[PDB]
Amino acid sequence: DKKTIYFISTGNSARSQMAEGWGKEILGEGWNVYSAGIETHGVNPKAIEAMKEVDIDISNHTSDLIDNDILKQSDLVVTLCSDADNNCPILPPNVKKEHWGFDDPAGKEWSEFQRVRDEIKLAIEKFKLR
Ligand SMILES: [K+]
């Protein structure tokens, strides 16, 4: 009944955490939304703050390693950065893979966290309309 979308970044730090937050609110009904990383770098505090600003709570989120069982059951795996795209394991033939690249806001001014957060929102809204 419910389909599965899996957002992947290098360390499950910011872009993938914001994608999971937006995904749960926009695609909530018929979608199970998860996020993971090749490595675990912790949840960037600025990513939590960025989502709080748009009234989305991601304070309980964890930085998790990619799981083979979630990959096998995914309808769509979305990679958000180039290293994650190349390091993602070879997927089952029935699992679709898409690369939605977004700039890394880490170490940049707060305005870049705001910008990337909103670009991710628009990409997920475009996905909902498919
Ligand atoms: K996660």
UniProtKB/Swiss-Prot annotation:
It catalyses: arsenate + [thioredoxin]-dithiol + H(+) = arsenite + [thioredoxin]-disulfide + H2O. Changing E109P: In strain: SW18, SW4, SW24 and SW1. Monomer. The active site is at S9, C81, C88. GO terms for biological process: response to arsenic-containing substance. This is Arsenate reductase. It comes from Staphylococcus aureus. Disruption phenotype: Deletion of the gene leads to a complete loss of arsenate resistance, but does not affect arsenite or antimony resistance. Gene3D superfamilies: 3.40.50.2300. One of its GO terms (cellular component) is cytoplasm. Changing C81S: Loss of activity. Changing D104A: 4-fold decrease in catalytic efficiency. Pfam families: LMWPc. Changing N12A: Loss of K(+) stabilization over Na(+). Changing L122V: In strain: SW18. Its EC number is 1.20.4.4. HAMAP family: Arsenate_reduct. SUPFAM superfamilies: Phosphotyrosine protein phosphatases I. InterPro entries: Arsenate_reductase_ArsC, Ptyr_pPase, Ptyr_pPase_sf. Keywords: Arsenical resistance, Cytoplasm, Disulfide bond, Metal-binding, Oxidoreductase, Plasmid, Potassium, Redox-active center. Induction: Induced by arsenate [As(V)], arsenite [As(III)], and antimonite [Sb(III)]. GO terms for molecular function: arsenate reductase (thioredoxin) activity; metal ion binding; protein tyrosine phosphatase activity. The gene is arsC. The keyword Transcription regulation does not apply. It is found in: Cytoplasm. Potassium binding stabilizes the enzyme and increases its specific activity. Activity is also stimulated by sulfate. Inhibited by arsenite (mixed inhibitor).
